[model samples]
Target: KHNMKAFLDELKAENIKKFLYNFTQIPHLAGTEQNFQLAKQIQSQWKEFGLDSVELAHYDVLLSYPNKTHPNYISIINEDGNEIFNTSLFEPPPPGYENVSDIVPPFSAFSPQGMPEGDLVYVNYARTEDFFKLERDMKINCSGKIVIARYGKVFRGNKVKNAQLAGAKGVILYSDPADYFAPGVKSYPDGWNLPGGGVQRGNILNLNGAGDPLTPGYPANEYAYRRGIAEAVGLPSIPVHPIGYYDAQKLLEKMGGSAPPDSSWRGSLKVPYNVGPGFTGNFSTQKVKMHIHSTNEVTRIYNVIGTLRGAVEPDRYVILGGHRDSWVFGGIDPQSGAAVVHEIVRSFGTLKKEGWRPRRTILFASWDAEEFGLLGSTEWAEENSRLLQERGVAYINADSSIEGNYTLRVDCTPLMYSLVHNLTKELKSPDEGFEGKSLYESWTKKSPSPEFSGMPRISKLGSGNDFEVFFQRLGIASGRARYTKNWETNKFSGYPLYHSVYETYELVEKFYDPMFKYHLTVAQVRGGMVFELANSIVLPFDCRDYAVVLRKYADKIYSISMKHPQEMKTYSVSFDSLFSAVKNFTEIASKFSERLQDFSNPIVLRMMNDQLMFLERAFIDPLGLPDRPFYRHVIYAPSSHNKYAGESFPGIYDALFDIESKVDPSKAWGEVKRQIYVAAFTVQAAAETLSEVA
Candidate 1:
């Protein structure tokens, strides 16, 4: 067993480095001929790597594209209707990213293609709360005006939705220097930061779920029932375009309106952070016009899956997956993950050739269309929901393995917390100048979990990558590991070149991971985890850890309840029952772990593992979260305020503010009591799932 782990470590970094170069040499956005060719290439490579079987999972999804013939642009019309400025539609490939084809021009996906000319308003980042301070708190309005919002702080789609709901006719988004540029940093080609011409292209579909906008909660298969565009819930209805900071500065410098009420609202732009409704001084009569010629069409996408059948439990699956698609030259985003997965698969094949077989089947999935809102993985998971819910043991996400060059970063369902902790301890630290120590020791020195005090902690499963489908949508245990930046010092998480042309393979070789040592380290950890999860006599899960996370969330809810003072008390929504419910759960988990100590019978072992597998399913409510049906994990769902991150006790957290806002307030009070009961019941049921039977 130890020799096999050694076999992985001995594998050369040069091979994986070459793999990264090949994977990112060209562009392969989802739903393109280039993307399809890449899927075929992945299938062939997996088969040649000694996998028993491989197949391409197909789906028809709604995708957006900009018209290359007549590009989208922004024009500033003067008082006499003469044009003052015309914007460039795409970021020309910078240095190493040059000579790339099929480059998708900068356009916000799913935004309605309309040409709207009106007064421009600078609305900061366009967060839901940002609009409140601009409209309700201050006396300003956005009705029939064009709003220029800086990107960051929330999902790009949410920004569009908030602006549209606030009555903005059109939106122009750009990254502020405060967010994208490190102080006195050189632009890309010279440094790994955004150049002035780079525009971030992204999806704006924050629907009831992720997948095809036409097929909400089901698979986007050939015969799947599809909704008309009018019925689509979260598609952006207003014209929106993202511009580079160069163009953004040109627009902002001429703006004239009230100064921003708060200093935090200001960025490092040359002009003042003004909440403007029109142009300033000499350019007072000018109007900012939007020209959008993007198209919407339903297209096919492929998720490549290769199977290595198990010697004992072939029907059961231990899955490892990552997306294969990219936004541009996605060297850091998906390809870094893609390269790691490729290396992991080859190592597994090498072990298999040496007559080693896992107890449970291992499936490697190269998911497509993940960039267009987690579409590829979600559709496949929905199609196989019943199969996956029963037989799936765990899902290991292979995306986001190398976001930056810091210590190890991991996110997991609490069931796998101990597994993450133990495996990382076995691997050597890959942090710069911190070599010759364990990953665990280095994590403690830097980026220690605040929740766990001095001890390092695994992160909660929020919504971001491919793990969202298995962990949140279905109830399979899931986790991801990455080498990331220090959030305290390097803002943008040290990834200023994200989603632009600067995310090339040369960027990784030059700055992010020069030797690919971090990539190799992450792969070692991932392979170690998979081998243990697949071959262990007992499933490697700790219910005590799971119970601990539940208590933390419960206490947070308790803290919130106390802040409300008399309302929760008067309405009989005290967290007393909830606290007791969690206590009972903690006690039950301890009792359950006691039964695993001396278990040896195969039949009994199967039953015990099955029980453990069903533990997370106890929190699943079939109807899903309030208004957000895509996320089913009631305890851990995408934060409604910011879906990119996780939210704890989301049901109760979402209902927190309505008590003060609603005039009648009684219904809001009723909702609070109902959610409390739901949480209590859900936790109690989860505890009972781990109960031992005679």
Candidate 2:
């Protein structure tokens, strides 16, 4: 309870001054030279905080432009012969995108550059089968024509990726009037609106592909040996950019190609949303030349390592971490929770100074380059996989923390769940008089909406941040820690400035939580959990909760099988093995726990702790995820297709997708069974390890 008081004391306004510092206010485009300086500045700041050490872990990244148009886009001319309309209303080429003159520009990145336009087809968002039915019924051939899609329904990258898969030559994404162009909403300065000429920024480089283009699987600059850029995988096709609905409306209005897109394609826009080319609206653009001579700055980055040097099992490990570095000023994506990680270490540091040590060594990391696709942590995990497999206990990652309260989600070894529950129960509970409960309690009690129908289970770890390496590839029983009270506060994703220049300290102050109270809370919860785990004579590995959650997931799979039979036969088997394994593992864990209740040998307990620490390593497949090699874990991975969202069970999910002939589901499902089996094996191994009667 004193820890709570110490926490409240630190949160006092005067104790921790609220100083707003916008480090590298320059818009740090993802994968550009601009980020180099910004990342360096961030690393230096961590060092200044007195972290043990810091170092930069570099990787290759690309900076992109949708379409570098040159000649001014053709202005729409009315049939009466004297009217000109601004294309910026619909992303008509600005003055520069006009006449194609002396300059011989190259074709767009994915477009057949010099190809002449054919009948225009309005594909709506071109999202699902229903929309395709409308196109087939209307007799509109999307092939050889430029498709105009609205910027909602799917990730802009997904839209582009899907369009290419559909054999379209070029694709244009525009905001619809319903969401961004409508009345009642204030324009630009007041809110986030797609103004005239405003372009949407994104990544489409099939990052789901294995490894970095420049450095593949190797640590970037560690060795002088490296493949040439041309040999590397992971580049995107198709020239893409976003346009305002104003531009889209004009184009749709003039289209005579196919019947206006179907209702599925229909948007909230009051005007009929359509597919066009009827009125002959001409739109074209070229490119300008520029060299990318950027450098990846070498600098200090850190993975803050702390150890309690366990009294009995010093070699056994329990690792806890979150990355300190962010793309820009990462208050939400990382800093909010990262600050918690800092506090966790600090509290431990305080304990250490006071001479309180654990029964196992604890490692706290401040991973760098997590934003650029979990690079640093992944590399470190890769380097130490063998050691982690033999001695690591549990790997808990806290990334992208927010204020307010939320559930405690986890994706861990089968035996780790109930163990966590017990630990949470033991740690500091909230003060009695205070109405504000702990973050975990608040998540459990927040509304009765229900996830399957009630509030969904706590979120599981996938390949979104630093945890990517541990959970996705290393198979370390793992989970994420976050506070998400404001997840739904904004009409859009809580963080609009995610991975943008606007992610500076100033914007976080204005848009993110101003007070650091939430940060303190995260530190307390995470620190307390880590403290208990490290001190335990035997690493906690309870499997009762694991059996329950696994059964729930199995039930979900059964339901999915009824709805999607083809997917079921092809992929459901993966879950079948997983369910069987979890059940078997749970039984073993129960026996182990019963045995541990009446301890007889200290040496056996130490050995059990060492084996428990290795639970996370069960997920690793030396070959890595199919197609996406850098991502080795089968159960959790950043969707190669979806940029921000990560998948919990990639193999099963991909198999379902495969049965549908979507996103290579066969391989995805194949991996699913593999992971389920692996998780089960790890649990059984852990139980057996701890069950020895000395």
Candidate 3:
């Protein structure tokens, strides 16, 4: 035997060091050409390590006109007068609507085309209750009014959806610098600013439908057959714009009707916040250019598959990934984790060279364009989904690894969760001389209790990284890991330059991990994990804990449904049935966890991990979500407009609120049911495997 335990320990340390060295090399920003170059470099490096045939997956990122000057987008019109300047960020009014309308700069890139200039209606947060009360209390018909709301609370898509349902023709959201600007103590703690008059722009047509405005379901490339403006289902029905608080202050000051906004709705603006119909100023825009350009960069990004070729089952494989792209200097986003990933690659490469092969193959991916909505991994996964699903046993993602010591954030099948807990225990602590303490223990031992000091805990999954495509959509046992305390420890997490121009090696050397101690440790951890996962006889998952959580969700719904019977009719599931399912799944998992402890037993464990991986699918009822066919997984769905935001229990929450709202809420519930079933099926599958082992 190769003493697999010792190998894992050595590999873990080696991988971290290499990753730190490689990651801090770039000022990777999103939307730039250099991002493509980074992808190309990754492919070449992986191949150089003798990882056979590293490849790059290409995806389109279409670009619109640069808005600093000439823009064909919306026009900004002064409400106080006919004075106008073309708004540089929205589609120019078409034929009749042009010149006659006051086009506003859009908050989102994807608001629908419209020309309505009615009285402005202030709806505070524009949440479900707010919209419902607006119609009942004020009796104010918003059929043609343009809704103005603040940016916070709900997802951006939800805001648009709410406005449209209330019969508003357009919507505008703005950032309250009072809350975020650095000089404001309660909100924007001094030194932080949103550029005063600058507005945070984005797309609001909803990410669930299609991406590009020109091409809905198709790729946004010159080659793809484009959709006629009328044929596109992706665009919103109402116009939308997000503005800075500077503009907001002017508009808010003009309000003539209704008492000031409720206390919570009040912002840090110098004046009392209230709705107004007074003419602050006329805002409008006009541009003749509707120019479109192809942004598809055919570049190479590499994912090195150092095939250890499992001794018992060469067919089974495990995948690990991290993106190589950054918005500027990608010290935090990808570099922190990239350093760890590279270390794993080097250690595995070192092991293979030494003739100490793993029982399963290990893949190291340095994905590209991750900053632009996980483009690289998504395209690659979409293409290889079928093959990867069959051959791939597990995927351990380290997209942005860092340190508050070692806190594990696990997102996977029920079985995987238990397995993670076990692994966390095995990783020893050098200080305590404890050979098998949990990851939580290692972290907490260095500080006060979590109750008072608030230990940096594991974060939930969201769509900023490459794992979104696999874990959120495909239901694969994919996950990502990151660390904090870097922020709290030094009042700077090193990557503070985040997506700004300040991201550079020089900055990182000054503020970030100058010693690179964490970098070395991350690589070491990754290598060790790879070794264990590659050789584990049985897929390590815990059904018991999963069943427990599912029951909690079921209970929550049950309590809500009982109080509001009318809301429950067809929309909610019976609490009895939900609990029954949870109980059954729990019983099944208990049996499996007991059986699969033996290291010698491969047959049972392999079957369990394999089945556990498919749990995400079991949730699908085949009918798909009510209104959104694009989103299927129940537990984790991207935000409607904020595509990058991840809602842990999307089906129950987002969908529930979506009900009776304009878009179909049934789809959300369908997803919720699907998620429960998927989780349940995984538990049951693992239980069967464990029973045999025990």
Candidate 4:
């Protein structure tokens, strides 16, 4: 009996700690010399770890930068054109990074270069709900005003886009104390809470779809044609900047308008939370404005790809990847993932020495320029889309695998849900009090799955990381894993110092994980996933579960319609066809499950596995979703308002909730009904794909 996890049993946190320590010594932001050097180092590490082949894949892609000489800042300009207050666009590094330089300045990437002056308006979190609530209940409009939003609910990009659509001139985002600081934790360098100086730097580049703005569906290479600025869809047309709460508090102090409708809409800032169109006192005449001086340049980015050729099926592939770029030192973002990738491949090298070979090929990717919009992986995936669509089994990502010391959180496709849940049961928890308990035991004891109470909850993949290209575009079953922060004491989602200069290795060592056991544990889980996918005789996918999960989502939306019949009748949109299609898919899946066993012949096994592999592909329309041409999967795509959250029938879901932002009564009715058909047909097609025989 060949034990697949024999090598995994020998993994140590010491090796990962050493790797992370080396990874965080420099500021390796994308499009920099240090980032390129990390790519070269990744290539060497993979090759030296005995991968069959390793090579660097380069793409000339458009990337963003903050103007270092005259950095972007937000200020209060008086009526006399005097600058009253200018924010400090710099972060003073914590103890570990005292001598570190080359830190990227905090600026929303891809926000257009300009100065837009207007009165201030505070939109709680800048989510669609927040913006809608502002105009509806508060009776305040955002037209021709500069909006200030706190970072939390949605993707940072969605915040900027929300403001732009509401007719705001510019946007400014800050990390609210209520969202960033845990109750009792001290500031960074003392405890894990974020200091007022820590500004969250992120990209605002989710157009119709993700990837490089200039090159939409295709790869950005030397020979590729680039779209002009006028052609790109998701680029921010107005100035957008991010400031720390230290600066945000001062701006809020002068605000004058209606008080926040609800207490939840306000943060822990000292000032009265006002939804403003103007300021108080003499400052009322002055304008709250921002100067966004971001630079866009075409740069050469790299993806270090390494291959472990299978002994039997060289054509079939299981890909494992994580981005290597960061906004700063990236100690926890990519380096935590980077360390595990290096260590896991090293485990493979040790196994290779013992003459072990996998059944299907495994490809490893160290992607660059992910912080700027998942650029490197998208380019590489787009370049080889055809071959990948045919032969790729799945893609597993380990991007920033450990953000907190809490239990592991996995975002996965329904097909691979069992694979993830079972693997977690095999590993020990990385905590002290939970001695000898499996990671699954500790995880589910705290948070159990809603549908299956005994199992830990598995989340749906949303746009943010490098999984989008292989998942939404190529229709491959994809998943990612990370240890999330404790939600009970803090609802911040990510840990403090996230994407800031203080995210150094020393912070990870002293605060997040002292022994690096969480990092080592995640590595084991990643390796186990890759091992199962690579060596399994039949693909480890549950096609029946896919139908079950689809029904679960359909039922959820169906309930809303049944409860609110008046709204349904008004829109004239029916869920009858959608329900019929899902039930048909359920019947087909059950019938297909009956024929899964007793496949003795290798040819039969191959055919059966292909059926399972292409089940997700059945939901993908060649023309893609309505306006989102790059995202082909009709069922799973990021919400337009919350890019970090997934929508289950995205087309239908987005249109259903967009009732407040009415275009025309007829136009709104037309699109919702149209999306209903679009989703219904996709389900019917998937049912047929399941019903067909080998």
Candidate 5:
């Protein structure tokens, strides 16, 4: 604890802010010279910090870039056959919105190229339920129309997919002020909220299977097999463009339509929200022309990996990562995180100078192209799948580490639940008036949801960051710790200018985290977690916590199945096996934990660590998830339809769709049975592995 305190104390706020400022000085978009140069710079810095081995790992992946001759554009055409405005698409950014000329045009990463003209239709969030409500309740037909969607509430790609399925010709997405702006909070140039013409850019590539689109289930190396763009499932079929809410509000206001029947669909814009197929009264014939000219190229991306070899078990690994790529001047999106990782390396360097070595190898990764569906991290994980599966202990990701000063939000696998809780308790809260209180105490005391009595609940890992491949695909226990805003306060809405050029260093210094205290706090928590994972004797993982969560998931399935007993019988897959497996695991894990301290044999310790390492791996099936084979973890995966949310027993949950007459029970139910069996056996296998050590 004393050594850990010393190490944590070495992380200076000024150093973190300086690193962030340096990283944000250049716009390091993925697959660009700036991005590559930043990767090399990171490598050099790590080497300077006395890291054992620092290498620039390369991968030739499918990526899209804007051509100089033809960039993406959007235009609004009036009823009189006049072009109202063709977007230059560049907003007048604030002071810190740097390198504006170098910013890529606002185009969906994998969207098809075409000039699709259609009447605009406001489809709320473009989520599955939102689409259903649009069709059923609002009586809106999206066919041949351009669907307008808000950025929040779901993955951007899923919005495109929902629109495509509804027969929409093109999709236009923008960030809405309802979700982005606080009631009294002023916008950028004024305050922290989004400026009128600010655009929130993002990748719309379908990431149900993230990696190189050309190499689906494998690494994107020189020797790897490749597929054509048409064969790739990651690319979007429709032309999609991102626009500022200024344009979106104009488009919505000019449209001829009935006021939205559901008040819930209304945004915070002053104008009345509506469901429009076209302009209603005066400008009924107006249409939106979405001209997308994005082109794909097979390009090489890099992953900067630095390793600090352990004094004892050098083969065992713990990874800390943040993507080095950004959309524009990604001050908060990734540079904030990159800065934290740099600080972590420096802290470790301090320990190294003191002759203190980790018991397990620690890897620091600065990934490329993570903005485009975790390409750099995913490719690296796939390339070294065998080695990672055998030796990887845990992965701690810090992407967008600080966007606000409200509270610390952590998402992790259940095996890491207790460790993170204990870690948080060790640090003092940065919140003013909460002086002398530990982070855990502040968090617990400020719990809005009373369901949590002690430590706040750890959210399940969802597919949004670099940890996706590590946790969902490779089955390594992984998580990310981010400081987020207090949306419940009503005084704070959200990160108004996410993914925009407005997510600048000035914004961080002036609005989001003016003191830069949150930056150091995040680094502290993240560094502490990684240090514990790398140094702990018994691995710090609690399989009993995992078993407990699994049991809860299994219970949910059983309760849902009881509603359809006949279908459950037809499937012939019961929770009995899973329940029994959980019971066995819980018993064996208890025994393992109970005897962990007393069991002192070196060989036995190694064996125990190996078993613990592979426990998460047991949940993964190489054959992969049903229909979505790219996501291999049977136990925890991103919702097949929604990328932002994680679903437990994904195959089983995805199969249980609404059977409201129009739906037919397909082979998906059979997949449910298969997955149930797989999960049960995997848990049983893990239990057996634990017993070997017990």
Candidate 6:
């Protein structure tokens, strides 16, 4: 507690703000000259902090860049079938951040270049279900048509892929005010709402797995294997363009096919949201022209690595990472998190100056091209896969640090669940209203779920942030700390201008986290977590919680199988063996926890800790997820149908869903049996490892 108190006390709001200012001073998009400069700056700062080793790791990887020669364009046709409303593809700069000249136009990264024009149809979210409803329920024909969708329900890349797969020629995505702007919330430079001209820019790259598309399943180093464009699995074939809601509203208003049947489909946009095939009451014929031109090339990206070597076991590691690149100035997105990372490193440096050393090595990483699909972190992880599998204890990541002020959200693997809960109880809430309360109390009080027994529920890891590689691919325990105002469970009225230029310092200072208290709070929590992992003699992970979660997943599988027994019969999905393995895991895990404090011998302690850390590694199958080979974890991964959301027993879930449409029933059954067997084997192996502690 003494060391924890000192570390928390050293996390200054002023220090965090200063680093934030420095990080946002220039646009550091991945693969750019400025990006490397920022990486070097990070390296220099870490060296100044007296870190053991600070190095800039470079990788020659394939990346997508916007083509300056051919800009994106969108035009609406009138009753006469002529262009009525013509708009350029570029977006206006936010008032305070005037570096718009250097910002790339609003376009999805990794979207293939092509020009296709047809009648525009509004698919509310452009999700798989949304497309299903359009084709089956609404009887809308989308073939050879350009689909329009608003961002929110899922990843933008998933939206584009769903649209293309549904026979659409192209797709147009926009940030609807419904999701980005709360009612009465003023637009940016005035308040927090997105301005009509503001567009959300993000990578549409498929993150079902991560790393450079050209060099999947391996690192994109100078001598690494590479694949040509034709061999790439995730790149989009149809052109996709992102536009501001202001422009979207004009095109949507001209739609007169039929008003969406469900009231839930309507957005905050002033017009009555309609599922359109581009027909107005006055105009019979209407269409939209979409022209997108982009370039793909192999480029060099760099990751800054700074290590504070442990005094005792330098071989073991605890990693802290934040992406250093952004779409624009990225004040709130990566910079805020980056600032927190810098402050945490500085605090560690201060402790070192006072003659303090951690028990395990701490690696601080500033990753590049995370917005382009977790490239820097994924490549670095892939390149060091062997080492990470042997020594990695836990990965602590904060990519987007702060936006909302309501509650602190934690996404973590089951092994890290108890660690986070214990740490949250130790830290105080920075909010003035909750002066004497612990962070865990404040967080749990906001939205307590009965299922979690009044504790803050740890969200399952998903493929949105840089933790994808560490947790999903390598099966290392990972976690993310985010101060959020809105969550999926508790819907709130607030605007989040994600991936937009408006996510600037002004926005953070004025509307969201006005005092920057949340920023300091995040730094304290993250730093505290990292400190514990790096210093604890016996790793803080609790396998009991993991066993509990595994049981729940098993129950879920059984329940789903019962509901669809016919499909289960056809797919041969059974949890009998899985339950037996889980039971064995729980028994051994209980025994291991009981003996953890009793073990005095360093060799015995090391052996137990090493087994504990590698328990997660057993879940990784080098062959990777069924068809999605890059994601190797058998227990957890981003759902194949939905790229952004995480799914447990993902292979089984994907197989069950694909039984009718994509695969033969027998083949799907084989996949289910195979995945279940893999999961059972991993669980049994983990149990065996825990039993070795005695």
Candidate lDDT values, in order: 0.84, 0.49, 0.53, 0.84, 0.82, 0.82
lDDT per residue, candidate 1, 1-694, as tens digits? Answer: 5354655664557777888899888888999988899999989999988799999999999888888897999999877877789888678777645576788888888888888999989898888789889997777899999999998877777788888888999999998878888776688888777888988878887764566788877888878988888887578889999998999998888888888889978988888878888877888888998999999889899999999998999988999999999988778888888888888888878777778777899999999988888889989998998999889999999985687787788888888888888887787887766679888889878877886676785667677578888988788988888888765534322368878877888889998889889889888877778878888878899989878888899999888867878886678777877888899999999998998776648888889888888888778988888877778887998776566778888888877853587776678878877888888888998898888766
| Comparing 1 and 5 on TM-score, the stronger one | 1
Could you tell which candidate, 3 or 5, scores higher by lDDT?
5
- The residue pairs that clash in candidate 1, if any, are none
Task: Return the top candidate by lDDT.
Answer: 4
lDDT of 4 by residue, 552-580 (tens): 98987676546546767887778889989
The superposed Cα distance between candidate 5 and the true structure at residue 61, in angstroms, equals: 1.9
Q: In model 4, which residue pairs have backbone atoms overlapping below 3 Å?
A: none
Least accurate 10 contiguous residues by lDDT in model 6: 486-495
Arrange candidates by TM-score, descending. Answer: 1, 4, 6, 5, 3, 2
Question: Where is model 1 poorest over a 10-residue stretch in terms of lDDT?
Answer: 486-495
lDDT of 2 by residue, 9-36 (tens): 4332212213223422233333445445
How many steric overlaps does candidate 6 have? 0
Q: Alpha-carbon error at 629 in model 4, in Å?
A: 0.7
User: On TM-score, who's better, 3 or 6?
Assistant: 6
Candidate 6 lDDT tens digits, 115-215:
67678888998878888888888999999988989888777888887887888888888888778776777888888778888888877877567588888
**Cand. 3 Cα-lDDT:** 0.53
Off-target runs (Cα >4 Å) in candidate 1 are 1-7, 489-494
Model 5 misplacement above 4 A: 78-80, 96-100, 448-450, 488-494, 562-573, 661-663, 666-671
> Whole-model lDDT for model 4 versus the true structure?
0.84
Model 6: clashing residue pairs?
A: none
